[model samples]
Target chain A: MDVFLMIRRHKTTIFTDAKESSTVFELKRIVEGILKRPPDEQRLYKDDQLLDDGKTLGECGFTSQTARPQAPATVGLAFRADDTFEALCIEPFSSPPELPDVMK
Target chain B: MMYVKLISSDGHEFIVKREHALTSGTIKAMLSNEVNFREIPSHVLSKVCMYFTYKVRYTNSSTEIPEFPIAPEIALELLMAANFLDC
Candidate 1:
C-alpha cells in the first residue's frame, strides 16, 4: 500500500506518498523531486531512527494508531542547520484548531 | 437554535445560543468537539453574546468587517476568552 505521510518543515508542510515497501532513500528521492535538495544531500529521520538512505519502512516499523486508521501519519521532517527533528507529538484528546496561513 | 449555559467565575449563568457560541473553537469543543458549555462571568459573557448576536444579525452575509466594539477594562478579559474559545 502507498503509505501517505505528512512531512512538516517549519511552517510549510509537504505532502507525498511512498510505498510501505519502498527504501528510505526512495522516499528522499521523492522529497528531492519537490525540494530539489539533491537526493544525495537530503536526510530524513523519524524519532532518531535516521531514515538515512537504504532503510525501508518495513525496517522502520510503521503502524496505524487504531483498529481502523483513516488518515496518514504526521511526521517531523527537519533537515540541515539541526538534528533531532524538533517535532512535537500531538495530544490525542483534543482536535487541533485550523488557522489560516497568515494567522499562523 | 439550541442554547448553552455559560456560568461565570462569580456563578452567574447566561443562556447563549449555540451558533454564536461556536465562533470560538474552545466553545465548539465544549459544545460538541465536532463539545460542552463553559463558564465566563455574566457581564463579560453578555458582551461576548452581544458579539454573537451582532454577528448573527449583520455580519452573517456581509463581506464587510466592522470594528468589534470592546471597552478597555473588559478588552483583556474578552480577548483572553476569545483565545480560549479559539474564535
Candidate 2:
C-alpha cells in the first residue's frame, strides 16, 4: 500500500508505512523503536485529540491515501517525563549544503 | 510472505517485504549468500527502501510513471547508499 505515516517528535521526523487497518499501538511500537521510549509512556495525537491504543487508523480517520500520493498523515508524538508529559515540540531541521553533481 | 530487516547505523530498523527489498542487487546478493555488509544511516537507508518499493511498483507499468522525489539534503547520502546497495 502507498499509505505512509509521518511521525514527528522533537526535531526528527520518521517516515514509515502502514495500512489503514493498522492499530494505533502498531504505529506506537514503531515509534518506540525509534524514540527509545516505552509505548505506554508515549502519547500520540492527531490535531489535538489523543489516540487510544486499540483504535484503528481507519477508525481514527487517518486518511493519507485520499488525495496526495506522497503526502503522509502527520502524527505528533510526546513522551512521559516523570509525572507529566513534556509539551509537544517539533523543530525544523537545518537545510543541507549546496548540491553536488551526483545529487543533480 | 518473507521479509527483510535492515538496521541503520543509529539503530533504526526498517522491515521491508522480501520481494520489494530485492530491488537492490547488493541486498539481493547479501540475502543469497548470507554475507554482512556496511551499515547505512537511518535517513539514507529509509530513502533507499522507499526507492526500492517505488521501483518495484512502477518499473513495468504501461501507464505514466511519476517522478521520484528526493530531498536535496539527503541526495548525496542516498547516492552513497545506492552505490553500496547497487540499487
Candidate 3:
C-alpha cells in the first residue's frame, strides 16, 4: 500500500513521498533527499523533540501505526534547509524599515 | 567577486556570483567532485529568475531580494543554478 507523506520546511512545502513503512527513519531519508543532504547530517524535530533512529511510529506513541497495513501511513516530515542556522539569523536581519525623518 | 557561467535547460547562458550560489547544498556537494568552473544546465529555472539570482548573490546590499515573491517554478530553477554554480 502506498502512503502520502508531506515534507515541510517551516511552513513551506518542500516535497512529498509515498512509502509503505511506519518507521521514522524512512521519513528522515526522504527529507534528506529533498534537502540534498546526508541523513545523519540533518536534524528532524517534532513537537519540539528529536526522533531516535531506532524508534518506530508505534514506539513513538503514534496512534496511526495500526493503519499502516490497510492504508499508507501519512507522515509529515519537516525538512530543515541547508544553512538553517545562518539562514535563521539572516532572515530577520534582511528586513529593515527606513527611520522617520524626525529620528534621522 | 567570483563568477560562474551557468546554462539554463533551454540553453540560456547566465553568470552567477560564486558565494551566493554556494548557499545551496547541491552546488556545494558537486564542487568537491569537479575540478573547475563550467556551464551547468538549470533545467528548472528561466532567464528572468536567473537575473534575480545574480542580484541575490552579488548585490552586496544589506537587504534581502526585495519583497517580490518569486514564483516557485522560477525559484526552483534559480536554486538549481545557484547550487550548480556554488555562488
Candidate 4:
C-alpha cells in the first residue's frame, strides 16, 4: 500500500505518497524536486525522531495499515544550513478575516 | 511512487502525488511531471493543491464526507482558479 506523507517546512506543505518500503532518502528526493534542496541537506522527522536515511517508512514507524482516510501522517521537515539544521515551522491556522501578518 | 511539481507565478513550487494532482482536468491535459501554472499566484496555487489532496482522500470514501474548508479572503480567487482547472 502507498503511504501518504504531509511534509511541512515553514509555511509550505508538500503532499506526496510513497510505498511503505521506500527509503527515507527516496522521500527526501521528492522534496528536493520542489524545494531545490539536496537530499543530504534535508532532514525529516516524526516528532523528535529524525528519520534515518537508510530506513524505510515502515521501519520508521509509518505504516499504511494505521493511516487515516482524510488525515495523513504529518512529518516535520528542516533544512541544513549554516552547518546546523533549523527548527521546523508551520503557518498558524486562523480565520479568514484575521489571518496572521506573516501571510500578508 | 511518482510525484509532480506544480510551479506558481511567484516561483513557489509544490511537490504533489501524481494521482492527487490529476484531480484537476487542466493539469491532467498538460500531463507533465513538472508543470508550470505561471498565471496562478503562490498563495492561490497552494490552496488549490490542498483541495486536490482533499478530493483524492474522499473520492472513494465509504463514510459521510465533510465540507472542504476555504478561507473567505481567497474565496473569489480560489473559485476563479477552480473554474480554470475544471476541478
Candidate 5:
C-alpha cells in the first residue's frame, strides 16, 4: 500500500494510503482530524463538481479500480487550507484520450 | 412576510424572511406548533442551512447561479443554527 502524510498548520498531519478503490470522503476524514471538523462540513471538489461521501474516487474519474498504470487524475484542496485537500495517485498513460469527436 | 431575527454566536443578527426561515425543517416544525419565535434565542447552525436558504431564495427569484456557494465553516454553522432554531 502506498501511503503519504498531509501536514497542516500547528503540526497537524493526516496519513493516507493509496489503494485500488477509495473515496474522496475518506480523505476528508483524515483532514478532519487536524481541522476538528466533520467530513460533511468539508467541501471537496473535482473538476468543479462537489464531491460527496457517496462517490468513490474511481467513480468520480480520479482513479482506476484496477490500479491501471494508464489513467488520468487530478486532486486539489478545498475550503480551509488545512481543512480540505486531495491526493491523486496515478500511473502515466502513453496515449491520452482525445477530445470529443465534435471538435475533430 | 413575517420577519425573524437570527442571532449568530458571534452576536451577528440576520433578519430573515419568515418563509426563508421556514424552509428549514426545524423552523417549520416549531412554527407549525405555534411556538413563540421570540422566546427562543439564536443558536449556531450548520452552514448547510444558509446554503439551503440561499438556494431557495435564488430559486424563488431570477438569480443567476441556482446554487449558493457556502464555505465549509459557514455550512456547519448554519446547520447548527438550523437545529437550534428548530428549522
Candidate 6:
C-alpha cells in the first residue's frame, strides 16, 4: 500500500503518512507538527468534502472504499491563525429630538 | 514613508517601509507603541519582507499573485516565526 500523502495549501505542500486503520483526524494530527498548526487551527479537505477526523482513513482512502494505501493520495489543508479582532465602539447619540411643548 | 531596520540572524540588515512591516501582527504590535523594532534574523526576515509585501499587495491591489520563495529546509523555522508573527 502507498502510505505516502501530500498535503497542499496555497503555496505550501507537506508530506505525511496515513495508517490504514487510522481516521482522518489522526492524519491531521501528524501534519500539525509539519505545519506548525494545531488540528483546531487547520482544516483538511478531499474531493471538495470537508474530511471528518473521526472517520478512519480506511473510509476516506482515495481510489477505494477502505484505506489500504495501494496508491499515493493528495490532500489539501489550510490554516487560519487567530487575529486579534480589535474592539470597535460607538457612543450613544447625544441630545433628544425636538418635540411639541405638550410632549416635552 | 519611514522605514524600519530588520537585522537577520547572520548580522545582515534590511530596511522596509514602516507600513509594510506592520502587515505582520507581531510587527504591528511591536511598533504600535512607538517606533519599536524586531530581532528576527536577516535570513528569515528577508523572506518575510517579500512574503509580507506580497500579502499586503495581494490584499490591497490588483497585483498578480506572486510565488513567495520559501526554502524547504527553512520551511519549519519560517513557519515557527510566522506563527509568532501571526502573518
- Please provide, for model 6 over B1-87, each residue's C-alpha lDDT reduced to its tens digit, 9 standing for 90 to 100: 355655554444444557767878877777772232244544455556656545544575464544555545456556777888888
C-alpha RMSD values across all candidates? 18.2, 5.5, 16.0, 6.0, 19.9, 19.4
Clashing pairs in 2: none
Report the backbone clash tally of model 2: 0
lDDT of 4 at B36: 86
Candidate with best lDDT? 4
What lDDT tens digits, residue by residue, belong to model 6 across residues A19-96? 567777787777664545678776677656677878876566553322112222557566665963222221211222
* Model 2 stretches with alpha carbons more than 4 Å out: A6-49, A53-61, A65-104, B33-39
Q: Pairing residues by index, what is the TM-score of model 4?
A: 0.61
Best by TM-score: 4
- Residue B40 error for model 6, in Å? 3.9
Q: What's the TM for chain B in candidate 3? A: 0.46
Q: Where does the lowest 10-residue lDDT sum fall in candidate 3 chain B?
A: B33-42
Better of 1 and 3 by DockQ: 3
Q: By the lDDT metric, which is better: model 3 or model 6? A: 6
TM-score of chain A of each: 0.63, 0.77, 0.47, 0.82, 0.45, 0.63
| Candidate closest to the true structure, highest DockQ | 4
Q: Rank the candidates by DockQ, best first.
A: 4, 2, 3, 6, 1, 5
Better of 5 and 6 by TM-score: 6
Which DockQ values do the candidates obtain, in the order shown? 0.02, 0.21, 0.03, 0.30, 0.01, 0.02
Off by over 4 Å in 5: A1-104, B33-53, B60-65, B72-87
| Docking model 6 quality class | incorrect
